[PDB]
Amino acid sequence: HQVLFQGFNWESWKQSGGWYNMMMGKVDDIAAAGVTHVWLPPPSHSVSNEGYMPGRLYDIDASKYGNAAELKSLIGALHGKGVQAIADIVINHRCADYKDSRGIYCIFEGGTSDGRLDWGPHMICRDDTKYSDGTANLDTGADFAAAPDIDHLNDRVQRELKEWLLWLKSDLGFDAWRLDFARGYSPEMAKVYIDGTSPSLAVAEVWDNMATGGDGKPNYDQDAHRQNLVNWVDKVGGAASAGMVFDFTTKGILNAAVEGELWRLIDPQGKAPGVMGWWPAKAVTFVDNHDTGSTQAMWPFPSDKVMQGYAYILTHPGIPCIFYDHFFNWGFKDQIAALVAIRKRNGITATSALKILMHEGDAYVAEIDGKVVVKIGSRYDVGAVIPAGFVTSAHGNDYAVWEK
Ligand SMILES: CO[C@@H]1O[C@H](CO)[C@@H](S[C@H]2O[C@H](CO)[C@@H](S[C@H]3O[C@H](CO)[C@@H](S[C@@H]4O[C@H](CO)[C@@H](O)[C@H](O)[C@H]4O)[C@H](O)[C@H]3O)[C@H](O)[C@H]2O)[C@H](O)[C@H]1O
Ligand SMILES: OC[C@H]1O[C@H](S[C@H]2[C@H](O)[C@@H](O)[C@H](O)O[C@@H]2CO)[C@H](O)[C@@H](O)[C@@H]1O
Ligand SMILES: OC[C@H]1O[C@H](S[C@H]2[C@H](O)[C@@H](O)[C@H](O)O[C@@H]2CO)[C@H](O)[C@@H](O)[C@@H]1O
Ligand SMILES: [Ca+2]
Ligand SMILES: [Ca+2]
Ligand SMILES: [Ca+2]
Ligand SMILES: [Ca+2]
């Protein structure tokens, strides 16, 4: 049994009294909902309030989310309920606190009295000429324009970041990682940190653009997109590795599929069309996150069909990740809890068997592990396709779930 929960949104840093402190009052509901892992925001001091422009990595007390004490309390509380904590690891780039003799912000400060993470421009990818001194290695991945990109090929960088990561575990209590902008560096570099810090899991944000047709809608065939993701997992270590990926392929397809085009939810082989269909054990599914939904809304899920999104991921293979807003602010708390209960009660896991029974425009009906049947779509009657012995267990707007 494994169910992730993103414990924050793009507005969380603004929370009166501290986000982590507020979250203490949410722990019980999250645990009772069957959640096993809670993804928390970048914990270190960051130039940007949301934390995605970290500077002093060890300076937890400078976070807009709360200080080290408050964070440890939250993680302690989650652990008290058997829930693990995933830290949002942002290491592709990093902001330098001080200027060098060139007037360039490239003198880093780790947050401790010694030289830990006290890097200089030699640790900045040389091809990031806005900050580099030309002495480092070339970036192993894409660049983040607003800040120095870190040369992960640098020996000291690997050593110290790994030491820091282990510190997040031993000192704060974190159990696993969420790798931010993993396209910023190679899967080989991700391998170094994953293999070197033994997290329970390391879900990477490998976000590639999804191919679309002349009408702007994603193509039915998204194999190129999920193949990239499968390849990333293979290169990071495959099955043996704790590494995994957010199922963006499923996210893009599902975004479109619910708009009366549920025929998109199956490939020519009869499997789920996203990563879920090729490597479910490595596919972390989701309806929306702080980037796609929330106040950034880069790729929101049709707001009137969100619960269909959850009926889908919460009953299917792959590791579903619930979004904070949907659970506490949209009023789906009880329905989402009930869907997880169904998943758990039936022993459904990321690798459960998926047998799709119907995949028409306004009706998708699938059977998981021969124990749970789920349906989404505007078509009301699908009773003819419901296997014998199944009885409705949960239902809502354009979705229903049966149990046997
Ligand atoms: C008005 O608001 C609406 O609320 C609705 C209920 O939540 C949903 S419909 C939603 O859930 C439905 C199940 O409650 C299914 S219909 C689905 O399941 C049915 C029950 O197993 C069967 S059989 C059922 O038998 C009744 C007694 O014999 C009979 O009177 C009914 O006509 C018959 O449905 C049915 O065959 C099967 O299709 C929907 O598919 C789900 O979408 C609305 O979405 C929501 O707007
Ligand atoms: O199932 C785990 C398996 O996943 C892939 S093999 C994958 C291939 O990438 C895809 O093009 C083809 O259509 O389906 C197969 C099976 O899902 C990975 O490469 C491999 O290491 C892993 O064992
Ligand atoms: O905003 C349009 C949308 O509004 C609700 S969905 C959702 C809303 O987006 C969110 O800001 C708020 O926190 O929760 C509501 C649901 O409780 C409406 O249900 C939907 O039909 C409409 O399209
Ligand atoms: Ca220092
Ligand atoms: Ca950069
Ligand atoms: Ca980003
Ligand atoms: Ca980079």
Side-chain angles (χ1 to χ4, degrees):
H1 176 63
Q2 200 174 312
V3 174
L4 274 52
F5 185 95
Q6 178 167 193
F8 69 109
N9 58 49
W10 201 239
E11 303 293 309
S12 295
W13 68 274
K14 295 178 192 173
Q15 185 61 212
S16 172
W19 181 260
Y20 305 145
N21 286 320
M22 188 281 287
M23 283 294 290
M24 295 289 285
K26 300 282 178 291
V27 173
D28 290 1
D29 281 340
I30 296 170
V35 167
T36 58
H37 300 70
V38 171
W39 162 23
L40 299 174
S44 320
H45 143 264
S46 170
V47 168
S48 59
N49 301 311
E50 307 83 6
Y52 292 95
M53 288 188 85
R56 307 190 291 281
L57 301 195
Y58 282 104
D59 191 350
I60 309 300
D61 296 328
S63 178
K64 313 295 286 178
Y65 294 109
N67 55 29
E70 307 177 328
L71 172 48
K72 284 164 60 183
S73 285
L74 176 60
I75 293 170
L78 290 167
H79 285 166
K81 288 296 190 171
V83 179
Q84 295 186 199
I86 301 173
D88 199 319
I89 300 303
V90 183
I91 57 178
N92 168 74
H93 49 277
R94 180 181 176 197
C95 298
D97 284 44
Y98 324 120
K99 311 190 297 175
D100 64 358
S101 52
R102 301 175 300 165
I104 302 173
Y105 281 94
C106 60
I107 299 305
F108 303 83
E109 173 48 51
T112 70
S113 47
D114 58 24
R116 274 171 293 167
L117 300 179
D118 283 17
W119 312 330
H122 176 63
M123 288 69 184
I124 300 165
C125 304
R126 73 165 182 267
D127 51 323
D128 192 341
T129 60
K130 294 165 65 170
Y131 302 99
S132 84
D133 65 352
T135 67
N137 290 287
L138 292 177
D139 199 338
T140 59
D143 175 80
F144 176 79
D149 268 57
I150 305 306
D151 176 13
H152 295 286
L153 287 183
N154 180 286
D155 183 61
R156 177 176 172 192
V157 167
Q158 281 182 20
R159 293 206 315 288
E160 302 187 340
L161 279 182
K162 279 195 289 183
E163 174 175 53
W164 171 64
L165 288 171
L166 292 181
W167 176 79
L168 292 179
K169 297 173 58 179
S170 65
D171 190 293
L172 300 179
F174 282 111
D175 304 284
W177 322 123
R178 177 271 179 172
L179 303 185
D180 178 70
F181 192 35
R183 270 306 185 205
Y185 44 94
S186 65
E188 287 69 30
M189 294 297 95
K191 185 174 180 56
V192 177
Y193 303 110
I194 294 171
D195 285 9
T197 63
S198 63
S200 55
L201 60 83
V203 57
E205 176 203 18
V206 186
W207 199 350
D208 297 322
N209 239 69
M210 179 167 285
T212 65
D215 64 355
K217 299 180 179 185
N219 296 328
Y220 163 79
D221 185 334
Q222 284 301 323
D223 292 6
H225 193 273
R226 57 174 169 183
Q227 188 62 61
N228 283 184
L229 291 177
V230 171
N231 289 168
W232 187 94
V233 180
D234 273 340
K235 295 199 178 195
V236 94
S241 169
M244 48 180 68
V245 299
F246 281 120
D247 198 349
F248 278 101
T249 314
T250 287
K251 161 60 176 178
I253 294 184
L254 191 59
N255 260 13
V258 293
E259 297 307 75
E261 305 191 336
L262 294 169
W263 45 263
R264 294 173 177 288
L265 299 185
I266 190 172
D267 66 23
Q269 304 309 315
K271 303 174 171 178
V275 175
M276 181 200 295
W278 286 352
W279 211 336
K282 297 290 186 176
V284 179
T285 55
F286 67 108
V287 178
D288 266 317
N289 59 40
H290 62 293
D291 294 318
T292 65
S294 191
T295 57
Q296 288 199 89
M298 292 181 210
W299 209 18
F301 197 88
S303 72
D304 65 311
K305 307 191 179 61
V306 171
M307 270 318 299
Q308 292 181 60
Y310 282 109
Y312 183 71
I313 68 168
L314 297 182
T315 62
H316 279 51
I319 311 168
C321 176
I322 297 167
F323 186 49
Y324 184 93
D325 293 26
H326 297 156
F327 192 74
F328 288 113
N329 303 165
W330 285 50
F332 304 148
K333 183 188 178 306
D334 295 334
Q335 292 169 253
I336 290 176
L339 290 171
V340 172
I342 293 177
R343 183 191 186 71
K344 195 171 176 177
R345 167 166 59 251
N346 290 280
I348 291 172
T349 66
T351 57
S352 284
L354 170 70
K355 181 183 175 187
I356 302 173
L357 304 178
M358 180 182 270
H359 45 92
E360 279 164 53
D362 62 349
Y364 172 83
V365 184
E367 179 194 287
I368 299 76
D369 281 344
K371 307 165 181 175
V372 176
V373 172
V374 56
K375 170 277 186 174
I376 62 173
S378 56
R379 173 188 313 193
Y380 179 89
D381 195 10
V382 297
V385 82
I386 302 306
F390 280 89
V391 183
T392 35
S393 181
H395 63 184
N397 295 331
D398 293 341
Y399 85 79
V401 175
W402 293 255
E403 285 188 82
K404 176 185 176 190

